[PDB]
Amino acid sequence: MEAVQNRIVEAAERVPGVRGVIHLRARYVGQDIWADMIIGVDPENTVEQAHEICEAVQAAVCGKIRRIESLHVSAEAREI
Amino acid sequence: HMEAVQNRIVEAAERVPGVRGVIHLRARYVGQDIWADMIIGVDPENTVEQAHEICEAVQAAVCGKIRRIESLHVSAEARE
């Protein structure tokens, strides 16, 4: 679980356009992980581009951690 | 009272420029007061920081029109 969270954050931070993981909430349900994450993104990204980054994060994270059964990713403005 | 309040939250939010409808609304009583979370639609081509300014404006408009609202979080998604 601290393992799962570390893996989740690491995978999300490899996605281009992610500026950090701001919040992560994750729980086991049986052998399954349910998770909700907020990523930081460039304030000057369009909402569409931010949505594409979230979509990429969702795909990257689920691809790297097969136990995740459900993951929601949204984005908030964050400065480098 | 809760259904009348929900329709008033929706109408207050929908008069703020740049709001393209309310995608999701959740409202719960915590005390006598209402705590709420909403997702508004916005222009996909707005920047994230522009979207954030719209959400902040929806938060003020709704909380100024409904005194029983104690807490409201507003987040935006791309909509046509």
Swiss-Prot record, chain B:
Subcellular location: Magnetosome membrane; Cell inner membrane
Effect of D37A: Slightly decreased wild-type magnetic response, fewer, slightly smaller magnetite crystals. Significantly decreased magnetic response, many fewer, smaller crystals in vivo, isolated CTD does not bind cations
Annotated residues for binding of Fe cation 2: H52
Outcome recorded upon mutating V48P: CTD dimerizes, binds fewer cations. Loss of magnetic response, still stabilizes MamB
Disruption phenotype: Single gene disruption has no growth defects, no accumulation of magnetite, forms empty intracellular magnetosome vesicles, decreased levels of MamB, mislocation of MamC in 1-3 foci or rarely in a shortened chain. Magnetosome vesicles are fewer and smaller, aligned in a chain with the filament, only a few have very small crystals. Other, possibly precursor magnetosome vesicles are visible. MamI mislocalized to cell inner membrane or in 1 to a few patches.
Domain of life of the organism encoding this protein: Bacteria
Protein role: Essential for magnetosome formation; required for stable accumulation of MamB. May nucleate iron crystal formation. Probably binds and transports iron. Binds divalent cations, possibly up to 3 Zn(2+) per dimer in vitro, probably iron in vivo. One of 7 genes (mamLQBIEMO) able to induce magnetosome membrane biogenesis; coexpression of mamLQRBIEMO in a deletion of the 17 gene mamAB operon restores magnetosome vesicle formation but not magnetite biosynthesis.
Family: Belongs to the cation diffusion facilitator (CDF) transporter (TC 2.A.4) family.
Note from the entry: This bacteria makes up to 60 cubo-octahedral magnetosomes of about 45 nm in diameter which contain membrane-bound crystals of magnetite (Fe(3)O(4)).
Subunit structure, interactors included: Forms homodimers via its C-terminal domain (CTD) in the presence of metal cations. Interacts with MamB via their CTD. Isolated CTD forms homodimers.
Name of the protein in its database record: Magnetosome protein MamM
Gene from which the chain derives: mamM
